[PDB]
Amino acid sequence: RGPNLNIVLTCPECKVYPPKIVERFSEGDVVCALCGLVLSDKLVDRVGEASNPLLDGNNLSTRIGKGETTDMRFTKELNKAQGKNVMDKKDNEVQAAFAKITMLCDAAELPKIVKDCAKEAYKLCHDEKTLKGKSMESIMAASILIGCRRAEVARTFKEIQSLIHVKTKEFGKTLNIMKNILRGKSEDGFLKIDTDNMSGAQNLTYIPRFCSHLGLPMQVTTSAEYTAKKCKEIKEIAGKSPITIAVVSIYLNILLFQIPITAAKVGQTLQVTEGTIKSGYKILYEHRDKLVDPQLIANGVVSLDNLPGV
Amino acid sequence: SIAAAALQANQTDISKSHDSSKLLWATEYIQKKGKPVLVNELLDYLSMKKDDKVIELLK
Amino acid sequence: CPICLTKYTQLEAVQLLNFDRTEFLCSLCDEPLVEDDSGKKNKEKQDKLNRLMDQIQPIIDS
Amino acid sequence: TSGIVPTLQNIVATVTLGCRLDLKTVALHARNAEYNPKRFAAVIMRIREPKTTALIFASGKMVVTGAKSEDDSKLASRKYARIIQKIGFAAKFTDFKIQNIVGSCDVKFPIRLEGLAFSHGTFSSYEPELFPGLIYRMVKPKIVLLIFVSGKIVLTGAKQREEIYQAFEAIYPVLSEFRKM
Amino acid sequence: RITTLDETVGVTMSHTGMSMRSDNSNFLKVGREKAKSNIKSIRMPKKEIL
Amino acid sequence: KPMVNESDGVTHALYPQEARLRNLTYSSGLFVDVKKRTYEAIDVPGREL
Numbered sequence: 162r163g164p165n166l167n168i169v170l171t172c173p174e175c176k177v178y179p180p181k182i183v184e185r186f187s188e189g190d191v192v193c194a195l196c197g198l199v200l201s202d203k204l205v206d207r208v209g210e211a212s213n214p215l216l217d218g219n220n221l222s223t224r225i226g227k228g229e230t231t232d233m234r235f236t237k238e239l240n241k242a243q244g245k246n247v248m249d250k251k252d253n254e255v256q257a258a259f260a261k262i263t264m265l266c267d268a269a270e271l272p273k274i275v276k277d278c279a280k281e282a283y284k285l286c287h288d289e290k291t292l293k294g295k296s297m298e299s300i301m302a303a304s305i306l307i308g309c310r311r312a313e314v315a316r317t318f319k320e321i322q323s324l325i326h327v328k329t330k331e332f333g334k335t336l337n338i339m340k341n342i343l344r345g346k347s348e349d350g351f352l353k354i355d356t357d358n359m360s361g362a363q364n365l366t367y368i369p370r371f372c373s374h375l376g377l378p379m380q381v382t383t384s385a386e387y388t389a390k391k392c393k394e395i396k397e398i399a400g401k402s403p404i405t406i407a408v409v410s411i412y413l414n415i416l417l418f419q420i421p422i423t424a425a426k427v428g429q430t431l432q433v434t435e436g437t438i439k440s441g442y443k444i445l446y447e448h449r450d451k452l453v454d455p456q457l458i459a460n461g462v463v464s465l466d467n468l469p470g471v
Numbered sequence: 472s473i474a475a476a477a478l479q480a481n482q483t484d485i486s487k488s489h490d491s492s493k494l495l496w497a498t499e500y501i502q503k504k505g506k507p508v509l510v511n512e513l514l515d516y517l518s519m520k521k522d523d524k525v526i527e528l529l530k
Numbered sequence: 531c532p533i534c535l536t537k538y539t540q541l542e543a544v545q546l547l548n549f550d551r552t553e554f555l556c557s558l559c560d561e562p563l564v565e566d567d568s569g570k571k572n573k574e575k576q577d578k579l580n581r582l583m584d585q586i587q588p589i590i591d592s
Numbered sequence: 593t594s595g596i597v598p599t600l601q602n603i604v605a606t607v608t609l610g611c612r613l614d615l616k617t618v619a620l621h622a623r624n625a626e627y628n629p630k631r632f633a634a635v636i637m638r639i640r641e642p643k644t645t646a647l648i649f650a651s652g653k654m655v656v657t658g659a660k661s662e663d664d665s666k667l668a669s670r671k672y673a674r675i676i677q678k679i680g681f682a683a684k685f686t687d688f689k690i691q692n693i694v695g696s697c698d699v700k701f702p703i704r705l706e707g708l709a710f711s712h713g714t715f716s717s718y719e720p721e722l723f724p725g726l727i728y729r730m731v732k733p734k735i736v737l738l739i740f741v742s743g744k745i746v747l748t749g750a751k752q753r754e755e756i757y758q759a760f761e762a763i764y765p766v767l768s769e770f771r772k773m
Numbered sequence: 774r775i776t777t778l779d780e781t782v783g784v785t786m787s788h789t790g791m792s793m794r795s796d797n798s799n800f801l802k803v804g805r806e807k808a809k810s811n812i813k814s815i816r817m818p819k820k821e822i823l
Numbered sequence: 824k825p826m827v828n829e830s831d832g833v834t835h836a837l838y839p840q841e842a843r844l845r846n847l848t849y850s851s852g853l854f855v856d857v858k859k860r861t862y863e864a865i866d867v868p869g870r871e872l
């Protein structure tokens with residue numbers, strides 16, 4: 162369908178399809194690897210500005226700024242003229258939304274992959290019929306958390322809602338809408354295997370951040386990581402939230418390595434009720450050999466009797 | 472038929488202390504009907520029958 | 531030519547025939563060309579002129 | 593096949609009466625009735641021998657919740673219509689439609705829910721920090737399911753018995769394959 | 774002299790950006806203290822309204 | 824003291840050799856003790872606030 166407009170590099174003497182083609186970049190030729198006949202010479206291997214048409218689309222606009230000799234009134238008139246443009250109103254509002262997303266992620270000092278994934282999620286999830294009535298803050302929070310979960314750098318709900326003053330209702334519904342529409346777009350476009358990237362719990366990623374907020378050593382972080390990994394085997398704690406199971410595993414490993422911090426300080430820092438931590442410690446107190454890392458007690462750095470009684 | 476008694480007892484009397492509402496309800500009865508109305512049914516609309524200032528204020 | 535959506539007049543389609551003498555073949559698409567529906571609408575445009583001219587008759591008379 | 597048939601616990605239906613109802617009269621005359629005009633623009637009542645709650649609106653539409661089965665909702669609507677007839681209003685069963693049926697069941701084995709969400713991800717959405725139950729939206733029929741690690745499965749959003757029964761029959765082999773400990 | 778924090782860096786970054794400690798200060802919480810007032814009313818008869 | 828935060832929010836003390844190898848920035852955070860004060864007054868004409 163339509164014009165072909167395609168050039169195939171076929172050797173006219175060997176008549177072998179597909180031909181073995183060698184691109185001699187140093188000598189600037191395209192040659193046939195069988196006979197050595199050249200195919201295209203004078204090949205072309207800065208002057209413009211980079212613009213990827215996947216993050217913001219095929220938007221092509223330039224602003225007006227002060228030069229060497231600049232009158233202020235002309236600049237104000239040109240800025241007002243650029244303001245009253247009706248064709249790029251959708252482009253202007255999605256650029257303002259991108260600026261707000263990158264400012265809000267940048268005040269959160271998250272990496273650039275989070276901002277890129279949030280921007281592309283916002284672009285591919287914009288102008289949808291099923292998502293029109295939700296407030297913009299919920300859209301931004303859902304895009305931010307989707308971008309966090311895309312790059313194995315996933316965050317939690319409480320620290321997202323600490324920055325964006327949004328309720329749990331519309332944030333959860335917007336998250337579900339985003340997940341459904343992104344899976345639909347992936348099925349329509351390039352299909353992607355999940356392989357545990359938007360997993361619901363993802364409690365293995367919340368260990369070192371809370372350990373660093375508590376100022377624990379990295380061996381305690383690895384021990385709590387092993388404990389959180391082995392909590393999947395226990396059926397009595399499977400329904401618990403990832404945050405609470407991470408907190409109780411961290412507290413269990415603190416009591417294992419005799420780190421001199423209190424449960425009240427852990428509850429104050431990590432915003433968890435001490436009753437939940439005590440209940441998790443009590444239900445994990447019976448599971449001793451199923452949580453303590455076997456090479457840690459093989460090395461003798463920890464022992465089972467360091468845990469206080471219940 | 473206790474609901475009918477409740478609805479007929481919940482509503483207050485139309486005999487107000489000011490003639491303004493007493494002529495306003497006559498004008499409302501005039502407007503709500505698709506045909507012009509006579510004096511007798513207008514007088515039967517409110518609680519009295521004898522002449523007062525309401526008829527001359529309406530005229 | 532509907533694949534390339536290209537016009538061809540009677541003067542410029544002379545040099546695009548095959549040796550089979552069967553069908554008009556395009557230079558780019560190499561596609562069997564189809565006949566335009568234009569030209570047969572001559573009477574339709576004449577009727578459009580007739581329907582414009584009698585309605586604009588008060589303008590001419592005035 | 594399934595070794596246990598799920599049982600229902602709430603059937604929500606609606607009946608239109610084709611009449612105008614005054615909320616204050618039915619709030620005052622009825623015994624077990626509540627009316628908060630500042631909160632909800634309808635009157636609320638309930639009856640004990642089916643243990644069902646009626647949402648009575650001013651337009652004649654009314655909603656029955658808390659019915660275990662269809663006949664319980666039928667007799668609840670019959671007694672509600674008797675209450676409306678005997679309270680001083682005229683009502684008729686112009687249209688009665690059942691619109692929601694829920695049910696609960698148990699499989700009595702733990703289910704690895706993470707593997708379930710990994711395999712059947714296109715119909716399910718998991719967020720344990722908000723709700724510990726997996727929300728599964730199957731496309732045929734339109735039944736939503738709440739999945740728990742204790743084996744308790746809650747089917748919600750049904751209209752009759754065949755759709756919820758075939759939903760459990762379809763969800764049984766994809767859930768019985770997961771075993772923990 | 775300026776004061777150098779001699780504690781662990783993670784304790785200082787606990788309050789940074791993403792901090793799931795919720796904000797508790799009542800400074801300029803105008804949106805919270807003026808969204809709590811809601812008006813609700815019904816259709817009382819027209820005569821008293823007039 | 825100089826430190827670095829990672830992608831996942833983990834902050835550890837940064838040393839110049841590690842900073843040079845990982846293309847990081849040998850920087851230290853700055854904190855300020857901010858104090859907030861809210862004042863209210865009866866606003867009536869003819870009276871100093």
Ligand SMILES: [Zn+2]
Binds near residue numbers: 173175176193198
């Ligand atoms: Zn060749």
Ligand SMILES: [Zn+2]
Binds near residue numbers: 531532556
């Ligand atoms: Zn063509």
